[PDB]
Design a protein around this ligand. Structure first.
Ligand code: ACO
Ligand code: ZN
Ligand code: ZN
Ligand code: ZN
Ligand code: ZN
Length: 533
């Protein structure tokens, strides 16, 4: 059951006691906070028989000091794991509203700010014990990665190492200095994802907005449409009997669904902070969906830096989408303002616990605000709620309402099987918007095949199993890194190239470095720099 480590860094018991003792001394200094921790818990003194059956592996300050003094810690993580054990035992056993629970939380705060620089001085990422957020009484621990030259154990999420990107294995920054050469480039970046004219439009509008703000904390934003496919919304049986038998309305409605994401560079790395799924009903779509766009899903992670420009950037993305679909030929936008059902997430797997879920009222206000800005910029000609709109156009039948995939209305019309509807439209106050944007529509962007981003479910399921949470800036940095690999490899397979001015399938091609997509034949008729691929 062997293995070889050629230059394994190891610590002498004096190095470890010298570096780790100041952090233990800092815990002991907390008075009277450290007092119920300076010795083992005696359930005979406290009257708690329950204790040892709850706390399987007891731990206290005296035991850690004894272990340190006798040299029982061989590696620094051994020490930090025992300090975190003592904290977790106290948090597990005691009530959140108890003296010793609060004492524990204070000691943990001190340990966090003391052990981080200490572990960092020993060549480590940090000194935290990390466990992943609950699922479906046991938690999954965060992954580790040992260095190929050093042999030291570090948090994979801390170091942002992924074998797929760096297949030669993990080497810590300190060993890379000793080599002399830098860590190789992450070519699975958000910037390197397939560029689309729609994504380009939202990226340019959201980047020119940030240039006007002069914020130093703000980093370059990338908007990429990661999946684009052609689907149809089938008409549900009750409505089918009422309108498709007569021929008054279609059996299915053809739409193109698009999934786009927003990424911001934070601390030199990509961080995904926004995601949106839309449905687009074209020129050849029969009524009642002709020339309409519908935001099916919308989700965000609150790590956009700077925090103040967050909602303002979100509005620029939405307004940019309404602007791009207007110039293509779409005439009506539609928004269903419905905040997420309690725990459940729309697009991003694990939300930050400190990220607030807007109340339906607040969310209705949020969309109203962006639409006011869109109206002021002469992008949107008008916007009204679903009730007010049905009277202005004098709608008399159910076949007149736009019928979207996964929308509330197809289900409302359907549950009138047992059966009042016009009252239900008024019932849902400002939760249904109608946006007025004003020659067939011709989408210049090619269909991007990506099963992960074909439906909200595929990405949510994969991130749930792979633990790609979006609950902290460090975990979101990791999840973005892994998500980008999945998109890059599930999009690498789809690469059929044709000549832009001849249409024949070409293998060797000249690509323009200035254009978005410019691949011509072997012969060359152009201005900007072309490159042989
Ligand atoms: C079916 C559909 O398509 S519905 C689409 C809507 N999608 C969602 O609701 C998904 C989850 N929501 C989100 O990701 C975001 O809240 C967004 C993108 C909708 C809005 O982005 P933001 O403007 O950053 O969010 P929001 O308006 O909620 O937050 C603004 C402030 O209100 C606060 N706030 C939000 N919800 C609440 C609440 N329930 N109680 C009190 N305050 C709240 C936030 O803490 C924040 O405070 P701060 O900015 O001073 O720190
Ligand atoms: Zn770490
Ligand atoms: Zn190393
Ligand atoms: Zn060109
Ligand atoms: Zn050609």
């Amino acid at each position: 059951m062997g293995s070889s480590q050629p230059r394994k860094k190891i610590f002498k018991p004096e190095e470890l006691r010298q570096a780790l003792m100041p952090t233990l001394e800092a815990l002991y200094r907390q008075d009277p906070e450290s007092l119920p921790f300076r010795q083992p818990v005696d359930p005979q003194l406290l009257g708690i028989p329950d204790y040892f059956d709850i706390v399987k592996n007891p731990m206290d300050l005296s035991t850690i000091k004894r272990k340190l003094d006798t040299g029982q810690y061989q590696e620094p993580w051994q020490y930090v794991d025992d300090v975190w054990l003592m904290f977790n035992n106290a948090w597990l056993y005691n009530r959140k509203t108890s003296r010793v629970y609060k004492f524990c939380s204070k000691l943990a705060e001190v340990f966090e700010q003391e052990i981080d620089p200490v572990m960092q001085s020993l060549g480590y990422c940090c000194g935290r014990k990390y466990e992943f957020s609950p699922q479906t009484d046991t938690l999954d621990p965060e992954p580790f990665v040992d260095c190929k030259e050093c042999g030291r154990k570090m948090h994979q999420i801390c170091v942002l190492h992924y074998d797929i990107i760096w297949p030669s294995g993990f080497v810590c920054d300190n060993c890379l200095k000793k080599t002399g050469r830098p860590r190789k480039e992450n070519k699975f970046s958000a910037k390197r994802l397939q560029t689309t004219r729609l994504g380009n439009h939202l990226e340019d509008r959201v980047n020119k907005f940030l240039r006007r703000q002069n914020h130093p904390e703000a980093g370059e934003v990338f908007v990429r449409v990661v999946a684009s496919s052609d689907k149809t919304v089938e008409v549900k049986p009750g409505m089918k009997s009422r309108f498709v038998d007569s021929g008054e309305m279609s059996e299915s409605f053809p739409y193109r669904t698009k999934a786009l994401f927003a990424f911001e560079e934070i601390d030199g790395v990509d961080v995904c902070f926004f995601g949106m799924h839309v449905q687009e009903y074209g020129s050849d779509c029969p009524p009642p969906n002709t020339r309409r766009v519908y935001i099916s899903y919308l989700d965000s992670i609150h790590f956009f830096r700077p925090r103040c420009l967050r909602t303002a950037v979100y509005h620029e993305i939405l307004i940019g989408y309404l602007e791009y679909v207007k110039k293509l030929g779409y005439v009506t936008g539609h928004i269903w303002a419905c905040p997420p059902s309690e725990g459940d997430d729309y697009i991003f797997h694990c939300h930050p616990p400190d990220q607030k879920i807007p109340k339906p009222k607040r969310l209705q206000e949020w969309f109203k605000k962006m639409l006011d800005k869109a109206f002021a910029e002469r992008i949107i000609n008008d916007y009204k709620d679903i009730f007010k709109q049905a009277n202005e156009d004098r709608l008399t039948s159910a076949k007149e309402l736009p019928y979207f995939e996964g929308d509330f209305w197809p289900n409302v019309l359907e549950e009138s099987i047992k059966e009042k509807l016009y009252a239900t439209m008024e019932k849902h106050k400002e939760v249904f918007f109608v946006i007025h944007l004003h020659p067939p529509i011709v989408d210049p962007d090619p269909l991007l095949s990506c099963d992960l981003m074909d439906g909200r479910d595929a990405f949510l399921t994969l991130a749930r199993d792979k633990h790609w949470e979006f609950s902290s800036l460090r975990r979101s940095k990791w999840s973005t890194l892994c998500m980008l690999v999945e998109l890059h490899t599930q999009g690498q397979d789809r690469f059929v190239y044709t000549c832009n001015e001849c249409k024949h399938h070409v293998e060797t091609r000249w690509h323009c470095t200035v254009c978005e997509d410019y691949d011509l034949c072997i012969n060359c008729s152009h201005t900007h720099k072309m490159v042989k691929w």
